[PDB]
Design a protein around this nucleic acid. Structure first.
Ligand SMILES: [Mg+2]
Ligand SMILES: [Mg+2]
Lengths: 158, 157
DNA sequence: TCAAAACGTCGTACGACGTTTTGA
DNA sequence: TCAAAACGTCGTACGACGTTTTGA
């Protein structure tokens, strides 16, 4: 209880410095609408101390630990139903990344309805807003891409 | 006050991620024994988020905040009489760096008596083992480096 | 058609030093 | 003579992407 809260606070502590609460637009050519909006919480560690990623998994009950080929390890929680559960446990304690969290929670809100081209569209717009709160000067794929390729598929968003 | 306990736990989580609990040999020419064992806790964030180091400072009640000329800011806690106070706060919640706290606390126990060459000498050997726990490889001054020099000052160890 | 599991890597936010200044 | 306050900067542990694979 109060014990579980101290681990969530420590974990929030850790995510705030090494975490990554994100929302990307991934192209998926088998999709009807060509795009998926991926939600994820990822925590990075050197494989030297890979043991730490299994601990977080334990504490959270969800997530995928891998070794990367460059000497790093990632622990990662992908997707709405499980990521939502993890965020509500961290949210009260997150400080630096409560915005990325709170936005992503409301992306999860709409993910069950993303077959609708305009629901998918508000989701992607929200993914951009998350990307501005991230020192990722990395993103090639934005909502504007989704929207007009949506337009090309004959769909009417706005 | 279990709220502090929540804040300390959060902090320990941060320190474990982007912190630095360390012990260093710095050459100081105006010292008799020419060497200080400097102990420190340090936390980094980009200056874009400079406010979080000031919060950290508020939680602990010790420590200096500075902007660096490079885009980053640091929160730093140097010296035994205020770094012991802080480490005993984290120590129950630290994970990744609990080893460096303990070693550094064992260093701090000796600093009061660091004029004594053998006492300095042992603090020196201790700092090197805090060095074998830091992904770092920058250090150019080793517990040896206190010894030739102590030797050459005509001291016995 | 969906979507997570698992993946590979470039760029920079950092870690970890040594250095210079203040002042007790 | 001590020693913190304050400093400057290179290397690498990370972040934040996009991509392939598995599988429902
Ligand atoms: Mg960070
Ligand atoms: Mg780290």
């Amino acid at each position: 209880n109060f014990h579980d809260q101290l681990k969530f606070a420590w974990l929030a502590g850790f995510v705030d410095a090494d975490g990554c609460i994100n929302a990307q637009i991934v192209s998926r050519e088998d999709y009807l609408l060509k795009y998926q909006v991926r939600v994820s919480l990822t925590v990075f560690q050197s494989t030297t101390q890979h043991f730490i990623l299994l601990d977080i998994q334990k504490i959270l009950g969800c997530g995928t630990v891998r070794k990367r080929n460059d000497g790093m390890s990632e622990f990662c929680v992908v997707g709405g139903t499980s990521l939502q559960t993890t965020l509500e446990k961290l949210l009260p304690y997150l400080q630096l990344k409560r915005a990325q969290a709170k936005l992503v929670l409301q992306i999860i809100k709409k993910l069950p309805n993303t077959k609708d081209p305009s629901v998918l569209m508000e989701a992607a717009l929200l993914a951009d807003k998350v990307g501005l709160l991230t020192d990722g000067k990395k993103r090639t794929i934005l909502a504007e891409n989704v929207r007009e390729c949506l337009k090309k598929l004959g769909h009417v968003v706005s």
